[PDB]
Design an enzyme around this catalytic site. Structure first.
Site, PDB file in Angstrom:
ATOM      1  N   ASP A  43     -95.508  69.274-101.401  1.00 23.90           N
ATOM      2  CA  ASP A  43     -94.802  68.082-101.878  1.00 23.90           C
ATOM      3  C   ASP A  43     -95.296  67.478-103.201  1.00 23.90           C
ATOM      4  O   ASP A  43     -96.282  66.741-103.237  1.00 23.90           O
ATOM      5  CB  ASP A  43     -94.854  67.020-100.777  1.00 23.90           C
ATOM      6  CG  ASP A  43     -94.046  65.792-101.120  1.00 23.90           C
ATOM      7  OD1 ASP A  43     -92.827  65.928-101.334  1.00 23.90           O
ATOM      8  OD2 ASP A  43     -94.631  64.692-101.180  1.00 23.90           O
ATOM      9  N   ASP A  57     -89.475  66.731-107.472  1.00 25.61           N
ATOM     10  CA  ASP A  57     -90.057  66.647-106.135  1.00 25.61           C
ATOM     11  C   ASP A  57     -89.645  67.741-105.152  1.00 25.61           C
ATOM     12  O   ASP A  57     -88.562  67.702-104.550  1.00 25.61           O
ATOM     13  CB  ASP A  57     -89.756  65.280-105.516  1.00 25.61           C
ATOM     14  CG  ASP A  57     -90.324  65.146-104.123  1.00 25.61           C
ATOM     15  OD1 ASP A  57     -91.257  65.923-103.796  1.00 25.61           O
ATOM     16  OD2 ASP A  57     -89.840  64.274-103.362  1.00 25.61           O
TER      17      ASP A  57
END
EC number: 3.4.23.46
Lengths: 391, 7
Positions: free
Chosen positions: A38, A234
Site C-alpha cells: 500500500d 495508491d
C-alpha cells in the site's frame, strides 16, 4: 531489455479489487504473513489475533526478538480502519533483498471493514512517508528502516498485473499477480522509455496532473481542479478516483464517446456490473484516457494513456455464467485524485524516493487488444505547471 | 473495492 532482479520478479499475488500482496516474515522464529502493498499509507501493521477473514496472524508471545513499545495506535483510511499495539521485531522478505531489519510493527487488535474475506493478506505495508504515519511522524516507516539499516538503494518499483478476466480464490493463489522490485528497476517489466514526474511533497506519493484527455479531447478544465486537494498514486486503492467536479465532467465525456450503447446510472456510479456475451466486450466503443503529468524539465510534460481494459474491472457474473462482466472502476472523490490499482496495472511504476520522482513506463503485463495499447509519451510543452498544484 | 490513510 534485460532487467536483472530475478529473485523479486513475480513476487506478488492478488488483483485490483482485493489488493496486491507480498510474502513477509516477522519474529524469531520467522512467522510467514501475506502483506498488502500500500503506497497510500505509512504504517506497517498485521492482524495479531483471530479474525473470521484471517487464516493466520502475528503471535508476539512466540517471537523472541519482539519488543513492546507500550503504545496504542489508531489508523483510519478512506475506507476501513483499525486499532493496534506498537512494537518492533525483525522483518524479512523471502522474495526480496536478502537482508533482515528491525522495523516498527503495529499488532492489530481490533479492526472495522479493514480485512477482506478471501484476499489472503493479513497485514499492510505502508510504503509512503513518515509525515502521514500514525501516531505521528516519529514512527519510522518500514521502507525508511530498510534503507537506513542496509545497502538497499532508496527506491522500489511496482508492476501490478491485472488478469483482464476474473479469478476465483484458487486462481488468485496459484497465479502471479506482479512484481515489487525493492531497491531497483527491472527492465524485463516494461517496454519503451521511463518518464518521470516530480514527487511534489514527501507524505503521500503526490504528483501533479496538468491535463486530461478522453479519446484525445481536452476535458478542458482549470488544471488545479485535477489536483483539487491533491493527486496521489495508491496501490491500495482499487479505482481511479477523481475530484467530484472532474469526475462529473469525465463521466459526461466517457458517456458521450461510448454513446452507441446505453448503460444504467448504477454502472457509471460504479455500483453495478455490466455483462456481454462471451468474448464480445465492445472495447472499441470506449475511449482511452490520457493523464498528463508534470515533467522533470521546466515547461515539459508527458502523458500516460490507459484503455477501458484498465478502467473496466473484471468481475464474475452474478450467475457465474459464461458472460464477460465488469464494473466501471473510476469513481468520485472528495479528497483529491487517487491513481489506484486499475491505473497502475497499465504501467511499471518507479517510486524513486532518492531522486524524489515517480517513473512510468508501459507495463509488459498490461491488458489490451490488437488495435490499441497503453502508452507513455512525451515531451509536451506545458506552461505554468506548478500553477496546477493546489495549496 | 479497496480504499486504503486519512491525514
Amino acid at each position: 531489455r534485460r532487467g536483472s532482479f530475478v529473485e523479486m520478479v513475480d513476487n506478488l499475488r492478488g488483483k485490483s479489487g482485493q489488493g496486491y500482496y507480498v510474502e513477509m516474515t516477522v519474529g524469531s522464529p520467522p512467522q510467514t504473513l501475506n502483506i498488502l502493498v500500500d503506497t497510500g499509507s505509512s504504517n506497517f501493521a498485521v492482524g495479531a489475533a483471530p479474525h473470521p477473514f484471517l487464516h493466520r496472524y502475528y503471535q508476539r508471545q512466540l517471537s523472541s526478538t519482539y519488543r513492546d513499545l507500550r503504545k496504542g495506535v489508531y489508523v483510519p483510511y478512506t475506507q476501513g480502519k483499525w486499532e493496534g499495539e506498537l512494537g518492533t521485531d525483525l522483518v524479512s522478505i523471502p522474495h526480496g533483498p536478502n537482508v533482515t531489519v528491525r522495523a516498527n510493527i503495529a499488532a492489530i487488535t481490533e479492526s472495522d471493514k479493514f480485512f477482506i474475506n478471501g484476499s489472503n493478506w493479513e497485514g499492510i505495508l505502508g510504503l509512503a512517508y513518515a509525515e502521514i504515519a500514525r501516531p505521528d511522524d516519529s514512527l519510522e516507516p518500514f521502507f525508511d528502516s530498510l534503507v537506513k539499516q542496509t545497502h538497499v538503494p532508496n527506491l522500489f518499483s511496482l508492476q501490478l498485473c491485472g488478469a483482464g478476466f476474473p479469478l476465483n480464490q484458487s486462481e488468485v493463489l496459484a497465479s502471479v499477480g506482479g512484481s515489487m522490485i525493492i531497491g531497483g528497476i527491472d527492465h524485463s517489466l516494461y517496454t519503451g522509455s521511463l518518464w518521470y514526474t516530480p514527487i511534489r511533497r514527501e507524505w503521500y506519493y503526490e504528483v501533479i496532473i496538468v491535463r486530461v484527455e478522453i479519446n484525445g479531447q481536452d476535458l478542458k478544465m482549470d488544471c488545479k481542479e485535477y489536483n483539487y486537494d491533491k493527486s496521489i498514486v495508491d496501490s491500495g486503492t482499487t479505482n481511479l478516483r477523481l475530484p467530484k467536479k472532474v469526475f462529473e465532467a469525465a463521466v459526461k465525456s466517457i458517456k458521450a464517446a461510448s454513446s452507441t450503447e446505453k448503460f444504467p446510472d448504477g454502472f457509471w456510479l460504479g455500483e453495478q456490473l455490466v455483462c456481454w456475451q462471451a468474448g464480445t466486450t465492445p472495447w472499441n466503443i470506449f475511449p482511452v484516457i490520457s493523464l498528463y503529468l508534470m515533467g522533470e524539465v521546466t515547461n515539459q510534460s508527458f502523458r500516460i494513456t490507459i484503455l477501458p481494459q484498465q478502467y473496466l474491472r473484471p468481475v464474475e457474473d452474478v450467475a457465474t455464467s459464461q458472460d464477460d462482466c465488469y464494473k466501471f472502476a473510476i469513481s468520485q472523490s472528495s479528497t483529491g485524485t487517487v491513481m489506484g490499482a486499475v491505473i497502475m496495472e497499465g504501467f511499471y511504476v518507479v517510486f524513486d524516493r532518492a531522486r524524489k520522482r515517480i517513473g512510468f513506463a508501459v507495463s509488459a503485463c498490461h491488458v489490451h487488444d490488437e488495435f490499441r495499447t497503453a502508452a507513455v509519451e512525451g515531451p509536451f510543452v506545458t506552461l505554468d505547471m506548478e500553477d496546477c498544484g493546489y495549496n | 473495492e479497496l480504499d486504503x490513510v486519512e491525514f
